[PDB]
Ligand SMILES: O=C(Cc1ccc(O)cc1)Nc1ncc(-c2ccc(O)cc2)nc1Cc1ccccc1
Ligand SMILES: [Ca+2]
């Protein structure tokens with residue numbers, strides 16, 4: 195099943211992979227000084243996202259713990275200012291390590307993060323994300339930025355064409371977009 199099929203090979207020297215991360219580094223660099231801290235990352239990728247998704251305190255704590263673990267896996271730390279080339283080096287180490295974990299059936303930081311996000315989107319605890327649940331927070335949270343893109347990306351994530359998203363579909367597409375430059379994940383953010 196495509197929802198469990200992940201590439202064994204990264205493409206770190208592909209300019210498209212580098213540019214995806216470059217776009218994020220600049221987005222997350224709040225004070226615009228060309229260095230990223232774990233403070234800035236957690237503020238934009240966690241504080242702001244959880245608030246916009248209307249997470250509970252418990253869901254926010256859990257998502258923050260995931261994001262901290264994930265970005266420390268890239269060499270990030272609170273108060274530690276890191277320029278982009280080193281940021282990218284951290285991502286290279288992280289992706290390589292996590293893909294080995296994936297292939298050995300060991301837990302991954304990326305799947306833990308996906309669980310935390312999925313839990314918030316799944317407001318009724320159905321174990322599924324319906325189109326209405328997705329549309330509610332897609333544009334608001336900053337994940338989709340258009341209605342067209344939002345409905346497209348939903349169809350694109352719904353790998354088994356069930357009309358709804360499960361945690362494995364979502365995570366596998368997130369991992370494909372950020373770790374492996376997987377062409378099957380290309381539409382995730384519109
Ligand atoms: O996209 C998400 C949410 C998410 C969705 C599915 C899933 O399985 C796991 C997480 N988060 C995310 N996922 C990845 C990154 C990220 C990626 C690369 C990078 O260099 C730094 C941050 N940042 C973020 C935060 C963010 C902020 C604003 C708009 C979109 C997303
Ligand atoms: Ca900064």
Ligand SMILES: [Ca+2]
Pocket residue numbers: 315316317318319320321322323324327
């Ligand atoms: Ca649901």
Ligand SMILES: [Ca+2]
Pocket residue numbers: 351352353354355356357358359360363
């Ligand atoms: Ca599905």
